[PDB]
Design a binder for these strands. Structure first.
Length: 580
DNA sequence: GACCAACCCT
DNA sequence: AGGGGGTC
């Protein structure tokens, strides 16, 4: 049903109204220095398609994109913004972003294109991107006539839906969450990704060579112990050597057949010398293949930086997500892996990396929302919460809390936050189910308000159909009413966990917005680089380091007021690794 | 190209 | 709790 639209040869004044639906199409998944293939505008005066080359050599048009008074509605404005930044062009005045609007309304829907959003409000006059571009190897930009129609249909759909979405957002009391939190956050994220993080490639390469040598050493040793040669990365091949040939005990079974997971092999270490070498092999293999080679692929040879993409509209809890590369899972737990962080360096000379992290934010949030007196009081005293929990479940004095008692108390705390069952805790603490249920029972005696909260929250999700966060983020949990025990059980755990994890997301988001405002007021050159759930990473001049030590934590700490204080720790140094 | 099993992070 | 090579 051909939609009417002008395929313009040049930009005209009536295309630059102070209110428009704009589509700036970037079909590359990774939008960094990626082409723009089409522009559509839809407004009071009609519907228009433009060609980038024309539209972007045009001062009038670029002035308009840049103009903050001229208000745009879009879908995934960060994608457009970053693609335009790589071309030296600024995008401002995005008053409404449908992708973020749909995301707040229902993360479960998985809305990843305009069509998905449109179905939510019964609008079907737009095609799914995957249908116009195909998928995988057949991904292709179409001919002008087909492209032109699709862009305009998305612009047109954005035009039609903004009011319907803002109405529902308002009804959920999520309108401020879109306009004050997520949409501003999108601009800060656009800057972060474009700035990117500088990498020392020679430092990486050297590490690759050392690993290479060590992998060969341990690999040969494995063959020698095995008494033959086999592919160690092959489950089928490794299982045979471990369980048929060396006759090691079959502790666990996979769908495929044999389980060679770490927690399994560690149990088998005593029987044979070959097990410890294999775990080590894999550990090394993992760093070489994922983190050295995978990183060296994505470094941009020109700028010497990696430029991640932060997904703002993906997780079910309101958290961010990072890809190409993921900088939110760089090794930190074992020193061998941790060293990788020495490869991440400031972008200018005489600058330093500055890391700031919240301390036990999830448990602090639980205390606040649960209103547990015993937990509130623990954090007001600034105690060690795991040592404290140990004391309370084991009924002992600080003097008597052994490292094992702590480790155990800690596991209980995570479990409460993830809302696990006696079985899950038993699996984690490697103890009997009865013992696990004794711990939990003890925990709830020590913290009755937390118990009260878990019961009440499951009941509220049952009554309302969703659970909310502090800043009115929302998550629907249909399965909570399901008659299957396992499906219902999982729903209840989400019921318990989401307001904790989700409210923590909200807090750090606000901190990021607040922090940005302060950095500008202060006219500081410091800049945000990464966010890893409970921490922010910046780079700034050595001269600016002392000020940031006061400023960054103050801003993060005052983001919200709760019944307990928030606590931030910081460090800085010449590399990410040294900011410890 | 799609799954599985494995291992990285908060 | 939430994410991010081998085989057929």
């Amino acid at each position: 049903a051909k939609m009417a639209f002008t395929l313009a040869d040049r930009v005209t004044e009536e295309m630059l109204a102070d209110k428009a639906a704009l589509v700036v199409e970037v079909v590359e998944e990774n939008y960094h220095d990626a082409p723009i293939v089409g522009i559509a505008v839809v407004n009071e005066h009609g519907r228009f398609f433009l060609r980038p080359e024309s539209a972007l050599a045009d001062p009038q048009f670029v002035a308009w994109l840049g103009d903050e008074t001229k208000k745009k509605s879009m879908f995934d404005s960060k994608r457009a913004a970053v693609a335009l930044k790589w071309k030296g062009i600024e995008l401002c005045g995005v008053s409404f972003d449908l992708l973020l609007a749909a995301y707040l309304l229902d993360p479960a829907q998985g809305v990843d294109d305009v069509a998905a959003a449109a179905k939510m409000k019964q609008y079907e006059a737009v095609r799914p991107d995957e249908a116009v571009y195909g998928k995988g190897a057949k991904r292709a930009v179409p001919d002008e006539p087909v492209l032109a129609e699709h862009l305009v249909r998305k612009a047109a759909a954005i035009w039609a839906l903004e009011r319907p979405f803002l109405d529902e957002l308002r009804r959920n009391e999520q309108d401020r969450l879109l306009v004050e939190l997520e949409q501003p956050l999108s601009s800060i994220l656009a800057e972060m990704e474009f700035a990117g993080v500088k990498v020392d490639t020679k430092r990486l390469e050297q590490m690759g060579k050392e690993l290479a040598e060590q992998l060969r050493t341990v690999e040969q040793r494995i063959y020698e112990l095995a008494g033959q040669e086999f592919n160690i990365n092959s489950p089928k091949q490794l299982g045979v050597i471990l369980f048929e040939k060396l006759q090691l005990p079959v502790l666990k079974k996979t769908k495929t057949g044999y389980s060679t997971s770490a927690d399994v092999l560690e149990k088998l270490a005593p029987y044979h010398e070959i097990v410890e070498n294999i775990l080590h092999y894999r550990q090394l293999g993992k760093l070489q293949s994922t983190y050295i080679e995978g990183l060296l692929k994505v470094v941009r040879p020109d700028t010497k930086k990696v430029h991640t993409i932060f997904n703002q509209a993906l997780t079910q809890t309101g958290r961010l997500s990072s890809t190409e590369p993921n900088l939110q899972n760089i090794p930190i737990r074992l020193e061998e892996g941790r060293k990788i962080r020495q490869a991440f360096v400031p972008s200018e000379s005489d600058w330093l990396i500055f890391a700031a992290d919240y301390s036990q934010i999830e448990l602090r949030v639980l205390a606040h929302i649960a209103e547990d007196d015993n937990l509130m009081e623990a954090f007001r005293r600034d105690l060690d919460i795991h040592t404290k929990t140990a004391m309370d479940i084991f009924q002992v004095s600080e003097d008597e809390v052994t490292p094992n008692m702590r480790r155990q108390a800690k596991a209980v705390n995570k479990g409460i936050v993830y809302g696990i069952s006696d079985y899950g805790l038993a699996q984690n603490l490697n103890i009997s189910r009865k013992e696990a249920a004794e711990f939990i029972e003890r925990y709830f005696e020590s913290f009755p308000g937390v118990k009260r909260y878990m019961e009440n929250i499951v009941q509220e999700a049952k009554q309302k159909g969703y659970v909310t966060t502090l800043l009115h983020r929302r998550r629907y949990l249909p399965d909570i009413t399901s008659r299957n025990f396992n499906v219902r059980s999982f729903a209840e755990r989400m019921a318990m966990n989401t307001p904790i994890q989700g409210s923590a997301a909200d807090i750090i988001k606000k901190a990021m917005i607040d922090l940005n405002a302060r950095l500008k007021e202060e006219r500081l050159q410091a800049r945000l680089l990464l966010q890893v759930h409970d921490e922010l990473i910046l780079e700034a001049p050595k001269e600016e380091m002392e000020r940031l030590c006061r400023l960054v934590p103050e801003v993060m700490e005052q983001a919200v007021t709760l019944r307990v204080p928030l606590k931030v720790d910081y460090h800085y140094g010449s590399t990410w690794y040294d900011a410890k």
